[PDB]
């Protein structure tokens, strides 16, 4: 009843989120990646297990967008930025994220993110580039934490779900990867975890008064 | 507050399936799009208003994958299917929701769909071969009820969290776009009003036992 694996159909949820150079996860670079994974505790309440960050190097070939780089203020060509490669990067979080998935009893990764085929498309696409073979996510599903905020909040923009679910988002942070991943970790637990105390789960709940 | 423009953030929820004659919504045929509009009763419940639907011609260049049209039993080129073009589909659909987002006091319109990225990469793109103006859908917003199934009945796939939410489901009927379309606007509506009638919504609920 209150296992991760039993939450989900066997998905393994994973909070990531993205910086980039542009719009287009095909030809633009990936700048920054973070991933969160989650975990349950005995009562089954979610929350935030291991948590990855990372400066990513553009990818040979790469186009960067100037209105990009204005809007999140990165500067791919400062030597102190401590980046890595997006193999690397990815390489790190899959492991991270099969060694959660077989300790969970989970079958599969899901990425949570805020309007997420955005982040999804630019990780899978980073995934390819890199010729990572076993990638631990669906290859098209995702739990997109506007729509989940919709329901639960009545609102969709992330700085303004995390201020209606009581909590704190700081605007000077909110174009680091690292920043936006754990407001919407938080975010996504807050939503399942208030479902489950309504008595919204597990589905028995209701009628347990 | 009971009224739709208060429940999303001024956002006109627009449930939308589609067929198609493969997965690349810029390069493959749209064969089929179904949509119903949502409206609040004066209690604030959620259910479906208007639901139109469309038989479409492959649009002049299109790829048609052999796979898809085995997968979703369509045949093109049958005189008798009684389709019309990717304009006066979305065109009729468009006009409908205009209508009913000036009616609600909605600002714009957001798509409900399961899995919800497919369907909307399809629509745009058959929106901007129309060359149609003033698409009323929000640009990259989509609530996706695979997700919210996810997070309300620990399902992700729209049969079986039809099942779930102790909804008919038939197999015969998945490969249309409007069963699909129907379906999809009554789950998402069951979640929407669960969340309400458990207390969870509107906000304040929850202190007024
Ligand atoms: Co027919
Ligand atoms: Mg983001
Ligand atoms: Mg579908």
């Given at each position: 009843l209150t ?14 989120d ?6 287009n996860?095909?030809?633009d670079?990936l700048?920054?990646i ?15 297990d ?5 400066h ?15 809007f ?6 400062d ?17 991270v ?7 969970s ?9 805020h309007?997420?085929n955005?982040?999804?498309?630019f990780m899978?696409?980073?995934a390819?580039?890199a ?22 909040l ?11 679910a ?5 605007s ?37 008064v």
């Amino acid at each position: 009843l209150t296992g991760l694996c039993d939450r989900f159909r066997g998905f393994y949820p994973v909070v990531i989120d993205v910086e980039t150079a542009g719009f287009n996860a095909k030809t633009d670079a990936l700048l920054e990646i973070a991933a969160i994974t989650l975990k349950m505790d005995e009562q089954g309440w979610l929350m935030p297990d291991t948590t990855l960050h990372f400066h990513v190097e553009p990818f040979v070939g790469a186009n960067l967008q100037p209105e990009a780089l204005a809007f999140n203020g990165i500067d791919p060509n400062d030597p102190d930025r401590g980046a890595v490669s997006e193999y690397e990067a990815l390489h790190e979080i899959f492991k991270v994220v099969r060694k959660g998935i077989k300790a969970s009893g989970c079958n599969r990764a899901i990425m949570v993110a805020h309007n997420a085929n955005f982040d999804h498309s630019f990780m899978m696409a980073a995934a390819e580039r890199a010729s990572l073979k076993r990638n631990p996510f669906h290859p098209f599903a995702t739990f997109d934490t506007a729509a989940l905020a919709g329901l639960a909040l009545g609102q969709t923009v992330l700085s303004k779900a995390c201020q209606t679910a009581g909590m704190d988002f700081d605007s000077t942070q909110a174009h680091s990867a690292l920043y936006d991943t754990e407001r919407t970790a938080v975010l996504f637990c807050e939503i399942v975890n208030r479902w489950k105390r309504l008595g919204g789960w597990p589905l028995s709940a209701a009628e347990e008064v």
